[PDB]
């Protein structure tokens, strides 16, 4: 990992590209609340259905779904959790969760630097509430944090920001917010294709962290 | 200190009081000594206060990074197993502490933890320098064919008898049951206070 | 072990290529069980058949069959026998052998970011009973995970899935579940190539692992 | 030493003398034991001073730390547990101190820490060589519905009330007062002049 | 403590008591002392807990290492070659027990190890502060011609008159017979019951 | 990192080359204080904009700007902070601004020598008040160091300077320095893009740092 | 030591190009006991033949001979002595020679990966007496464990072996056994070569490590 | 504990008691205190148990690691000098023993080694509580003309008479020759219970 | 040092091809002793011949004569008398001369693998006493040992060994054997070329080691 002559670093734009071959994911900020929706392309019958986690705790408070390598993705994840335990046990709570990510992003920093070691080819989107409230991250590569308002990471992404750069508005109600993620995750699909039940995680100011069952996401196809 | 942990069928309930005490001076009136480490489960700490609320915050780390990744609840033998490591790994440069630690897991269990890692399953446990006198109670007074109404008042009656015996124990008590149906259920000071009134106790 | 310009690693790639080239293994879950089945290619007869063990016992509820390079094999079956101490010592008890798949899979991602090591050339497949009941999966040379219901590793992968998404049903019993995974095992081979007696081994809830002796083999075929 | 803290409706009222002393001997008659962490947050030292002193530092710059980095400041809950964190990693090397934290996190706090960690809340606490003497005083003419001057002349009746029985204590009084509206305010000398000399006190 | 190993031809007959004591103060009615540490191997612990319950669960998971490793059982001789290795690497920072193993492997053996690794076969051994009660009636009473069931009306005896002259034993008696044929029998409480109703034993 | 026959670091040139990509940027001291403004392009409506700082603060006093790689540049604020602190709890107080610029221009200096790793491809500007009164710094990716009187970073360096040694004179008042740091960053832009409303701080000498909010920004345009 | 684009390790394939240049070994199993025979072709006069030791003792049940590079053959079989040592110390005695065989074979196979070392040369045949009986065993320079009945290994393996899958059988005495290996080891010579006298070891089950003196070697060529 | 060693012409005799006592409480009536760690070496410990234990499962691996190497056994000197640049690496730590090392190496040798490593020769020596009785005996009636079978009545005389005065002491001899002709050789205990019932004791 | 397709290791080869530019050196097993024989050719006067030792003693019974390149001759010089004074502290005597040179040769074949390090370029000949006798050895930069009873390092081994598998014999006499040691040495050199006072040192059982004097070589010419 050194510069090109263009001012480029090469490692982190071919992570890029193990990034545009994962799932599409959705992160989008509702009337005191935060949205995930993640795309689940089981294409086995053989597939057990029952222990495919899209989308991943580290918190009963904060979630992230991930996509591109998906070994580096689960170690991302671990180390996120970890992370999350040590500021509970040296603080009491978990403030904020921008210096989680920035404790993620800052590991994620480290390999682009030192020659022993390759870039993760994973984007993560962080999500939960703190005492900010509701709050929404997206995680690059080059360990680069946005904080966002509807984010799409993976393969289908410019299709669903170009969906949401459109037809989003503000401060949606939850079962609006969820009907515009599940059309906008149709408008990445092409024609052939249609959605078997993806996976939705919703959490409201106050409350923990709800997951939707099966049949509440297949009424909300 | 005063603290209970009683079985009965399908409940757990464990209870304090409340005083911090410096060698006969009482510096706070109002501790906390009854924690909740899980969805089902929760720990009654004793001894010095310091290492007694680390072990509270690591335990609460470690049962909670155990759930999300395993997606299923530590079972409560392995919490006393996982604290009879961790206790037992110092040895030498001790934890001072004794706990209790009470859950269900399709059972109900209370297990008795030392300063030293030894982690022992019973049907009613206590711990603290008040310990004789509930000791005393319970010997005299249990059944495992008991309510849980019958169990609160029991404790309530255990703990007061401690504490009019003991100096290094007293003020309001905290009374937490654990069910499978209700889970984690901190009794309100209303009707702890109800029940010491009724029973005809004045603390 | 770094990117290429089209977002892959070169090295997990050439690492499947190796792996593709070891013996044909089925998983297949029944009714209250896990089956593994592997092949037991003895092409002399100076070979020892007492010791020929295909199928590695990790655990007297927890069994793996590996695929790929057999000394890679033999060092990750050693990994998952100790880390699966580990946690009957740390624990008292095995509660899910998906941790156990995530430590063996953590040590084989981390070969594939530090330069000074190649990756293991091994595909494995992890089977047992823990609180959970039945549980069956997969680990892929990259580090990744999938929980299963039917697999099969090794050189004629695609034969016996292929005859697996067609030919399995849910809840069977143990003998149709083993006559099902010989016959998608005959499927494998071509002709001229008859089974010698393969490996199978059976665990059901409640009870521990039970590999079969010979002239049960034998008269399953 | 001598030294309290008061929790009032939306106030926190924390003081001290200034007599640092060298087993029998009056080293030095004005010291510094109240000092200002953060905006709404001040401790208050009693024990050695060095360690003391270093912690202050410490303090100043983990919560500075944790303000820049957060954009809000710490919960006074989450300063008592870094300092309960901090003493209890060493406990064998120890610092050898006692202190009271107080703030404003939407709700006013006093937590008192010992020697080895232990974090307790209370709401009214005071650390030093003339504690039982202000212990005394706030048994009998403490009361939650007080206004804050009525608070401030609490606190210098109390700390009177110790320098008049204890040797150890004496000195000028340093009184502050936090609130949200008007933040961490070190009330002036010439203020606790007036009230010292306003209720019949000799100082 | 109370415990007892006896070698019988083809049989190896371990038992003790149950009660966990502090310093005179009968804290646990229900302890377990006899644990079994491979399909024909048993080992019993005595002395401090925590040490003794960290030995346990590290032999189970040696043993079971080996088991898999080896497709064949350790040998006892290995077993008690193992335990003497890990007891006497520590020497100065020591675990405060004191074991017996027992077992078969093509003979029954019964070894006794100390705090600091010295392994000693022998016929019949017994550790606990019960100890020389145990060893009176089985320098009298023990016969090597004796078969398993007077073996463990044997037992039964020596550990009742162990609990009348010693105070930090009593309780429930666990035996486990272990042979070649049927393994490791952990009797059950209705026969334990059956036979010390039967000697003539109230307890 | 080696030399070049030239006498030139090669590695250094594509980290400016980097530099050159990144947000313009300026710093401007006036009569007893100094500016720092930032320019806040953020393109789409979906990002938060109550979370962008682009004006990081390291002390109450003392307030860097960043320009080039963001990830770089979010481990060299914390470096910053880090240090700051280290000086606060060794000494008592920030004596000198320059001694916190040489340590983190030191550590951005050892990373231009030793082989295992790349240098950072980021320019920043330090700023605040200490006993020398206001004083304002440049570091160079090279970890060079310059003190200024006005200064810009970023792709529309040039054309701010070459504004700067025409339009800037000495002792300005505060809204004066802030109008002309305004048409500076309005002479760095190219016809079509207008600014949406920047970030401007600015300090004083005795008073403590005080970023400017938005309707004050939207009425000093 | 990397994968090759067909799956391949070089470095462990020009090992055994390096192992394809070592004296030839047999190794047979004969009624509860093992022989190891081993050429012993001394070119001059001048080698002291009193300290030719080509088979040499692991334990005085556990014997091993090798082929290869000898240097590295000294080295694998002095970590062989030592690490049955410390089986013996630690559990008393050794029960199974399969795990002697997996700690040298995971000594070979540690320096199949890691890449600041190359892979040994040498192919090794052990042989004893354990608690299952007799055991024979081959490793392979990828550090790869077969049980034999019947071995070769060196420069003229394939005439050995091709021998031995057509001239072998089961149950023979000592005398046959060793006849039957002579002229194996003949049969691997080509015409113009005789055998000057090889080296001859047995151990039957009980006694122990019986290596053959002149005289008897002589009478049985 | 006693132990004899006895160097007679081209002939080594070595012997001891069985008895493991815990500080007056016979707790093993057969140990095993006589070792063969070579072919034509044999060591002999006394002190305590485990590091006794250590150090013989050491010196058999290093001295068939020595055989194995260099195809010719250790010499008896190295074997006391191995065992004394051993025993004095820790020297503060140390192993508590007492050993004697006899053999043959075209001379015989008995070799007594210390707790701190110091390794002297002589023509008979003797480690244990019960060494100044087998010295009184070794004092008055040996001689270096005798035959091995005088060399074995005499050893049998030695350890019977510190056996009827030393109450550690007790328990079967063990007696093993070490000849060049026929190695080590352990003698049987028909013999040895012949050879004390002949010359008129009873052990 | 890594493998060559062949199966040959370069470092090594070249490392011998270093050792053929070195002095001729014969050692040669008597009758109860052993010979070192090693050419002295000085050819400035300006060389002090007081202290030119080509024959290095190693311990009063055991010494060495080394060819190749002379600074790596030193260093294993060395190496091998602090082996054989670490020898003699925890023994008390050096039974047997074969581990010294075992510890020296693997000394010199662990540089044969790891990357960082060359090869030794240097062959040695050690020879001595101990209690199986007199004993001649031969150490191979590869770290290969071969027991002789006469041999030659250097640049003209071929010679001496070609004149030493027709002109010597067993059990000679100290004179005849150096005698025969002295014209080998002169059928190695080619016309024009006289020998200058070689360096002769020989030991017999019992005795220390002895090396001649001037004189005494001069009469041995």
């Known amino acids: 990992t050194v510069f090109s002559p263009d001012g480029r670093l090469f490692?982190?734009?071919?992570?890029?590209?193990?990034?545009?071959?994962?799932?599409?994911?959705?992160?989008?900020?509702?009337?005191?609340?935060?949205?995930?929706?993640?795309?689940?392309?089981?294409?086995?019958?053989?597939?057990?259905?029952?222990?495919?986690?899209?989308?991943?705790?580290i918190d009963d408070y904060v979630a992230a779904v991930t996509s591109g390598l998906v070994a580096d993705a689960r170690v991302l994840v671990d180390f996120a959790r970890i992370s999350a335990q040590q500021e509970k046990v040296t603080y009491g709570s978990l403030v904020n969760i921008e210096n989680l990510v920035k404790r993620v992003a800052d590991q994620m920093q480290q390999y682009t630097q030192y020659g022993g070691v390759r870039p993760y080819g994973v984007s993560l989107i962080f999500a939960g509430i703190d005492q900010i409230g509701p709050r929404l991250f997206d995680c690059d590569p080059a360990g680069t944090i946005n904080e966002y308002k509807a984010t799409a990471i993976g393969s289908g992404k410019d299709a669903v920001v170009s969906f949401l750069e459109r037809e989003y508005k503000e401060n949606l109600p939850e079962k609006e917010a969820v009907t515009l993620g599940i059309k906008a995750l149709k408008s990445s699909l092409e024609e052939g294709e249609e959605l078997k039940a993806p996976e939705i995680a919703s959490i409201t100011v106050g409350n923990k962290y709800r997951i939707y069952d099966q049949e509440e996401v297949k009424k909300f196809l | 200190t005063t603290t209970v942990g009683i079985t009965l069928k399908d409940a757990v309930i464990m209870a304090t009081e409340r005083?911090?005490?410096?060698?006969?001076?009482?510096?706070?009136?109002?501790?906390?000594?009854?924690?909740?480490?899980?969805?089902?489960?929760?720990?009654?700490?004793?001894?010095?206060?310091?290492?007694?609320?680390?072990?509270?915050?690591?335990?609460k780390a470690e049962l909670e990074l155990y759930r999300l990744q395993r997606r299923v609840n530590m079972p409560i033998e392995a919490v006393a197993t996982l604290l009879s490591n961790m206790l037992n790994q110092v040895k030498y440069m001790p934890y001072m502490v004794q706990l209790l630690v009470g859950g269900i897991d399709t059972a109900p269990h209370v297990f008795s933890i030392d300063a030293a890692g030894g982690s022992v399953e019973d049907i009613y446990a206590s711990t603290g320098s008040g310990?004789?006198?509930?000791?005393?109670?319970?010997?005299?007074?249990?059944?495992?064919?008991?309510?849980?109404?019958?169990?609160?008042?029991?404790?309530?009656?255990?703990?007061?008898?401690?504490?009019?015996?003991?100096?290094?124990?007293?003020?309001?008590?905290?009374?937490?049951?654990?069910?499978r149906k209700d889970g984690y259920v901190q009794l309100p000071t209303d009707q702890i206070e109800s029940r010491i009134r009724k029973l005809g106790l004045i603390l």
Chains 1, 3, 6, 7, 9 share one sequence.
Do not use: C, W
């Not at chain 2, 005490?21 to 009854?34: C, D, Q």
């Not at chain 2, 909740?36 to 690591?58: E, F, K, N, S």
């Not at chain 2, 109670?137 to 404790?155: I, P």
């Open chain 2, 131 to 179: 310990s004789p006198f509930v000791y005393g109670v319970l010997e005299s007074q249990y059944s495992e064919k008991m309510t849980v109404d019958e169990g609160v008042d029991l404790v309530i009656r255990a703990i007061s008898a401690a504490k009019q015996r003991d100096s290094a124990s007293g003020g309001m008590i905290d009374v937490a049951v654990i069910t």
């Open chain 2, 19 to 59: 005083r911090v005490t410096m060698e006969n001076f009482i510096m706070h009136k109002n501790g906390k000594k009854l924690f909740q480490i899980d969805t089902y489960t929760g720990m009654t700490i004793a001894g010095l206060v310091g290492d007694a609320q680390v072990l509270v915050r690591y335990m």
């Open chain 1, 11 to 57: 490692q982190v734009e071919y992570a890029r590209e193990a990034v545009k071959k994962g799932s599409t994911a959705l992160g989008m900020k509702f009337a005191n609340g935060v949205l995930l929706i993640s795309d689940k392309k089981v294409r086995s019958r053989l597939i057990e259905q029952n222990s495919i986690e899209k989308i991943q705790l």
